């Protein structure tokens, strides 16, 4: 597993830029 992977799969309908402890998500 992977944090950014989890977020990526979650925000499939959007765009998520994972950056270390942060993540940015544009819908």
Oligomer: monomer
Tally of separate domains = 1
Measured as a percent range, the helix fraction is 25-40%
Total number of strands: 2
The strand line-up of the biggest sheet is 1-2
Largest sheet: 2 strands, antiparallel
Beta fraction: 35-45%
Structural class by SSE content? alpha+beta
**Total number of helices:** 1
Report the radius of gyration as a whole number of Å. 8 Å
Distance between the termini: 24 Å
Shape field = flat
Q: SSE order, as H and E?
A: HEE
PDB class: de novo protein
Keywords: heterogeneous backbone foldamer, DE novo protein
Assembly: monomeric
Entry title: Heterogeneous-Backbone Mimics of a Designed Disulfide-Rich Protein: Aib turn, Aib helix, N-methyl hairpin
Could you describe the 3D structure shown?
The PDB classes it as de novo protein. The entry lists the keywords heterogeneous backbone foldamer, DE novo protein. The assembly is monomeric. By secondary structure, the protein is α+β, with helices and mostly antiparallel strands. The chain has one domain. 30% of the residues lie in helices and 37% in strands. It is built from one helix and two strands; from the N terminus they run αββ. A two-stranded antiparallel ribbon has the order 1-2. Strand 1 and strand 2 form a beta hairpin. The longest helix has 8 residues, at 3-10. It is flat.
């Amino acid at each position: 597993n992977d944090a950014c992977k989890a977020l990526k799969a979650r925000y499939a309908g959007c765009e998520v830029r994972c950056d270390x402890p942060r993540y940015e998500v544009h819908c």
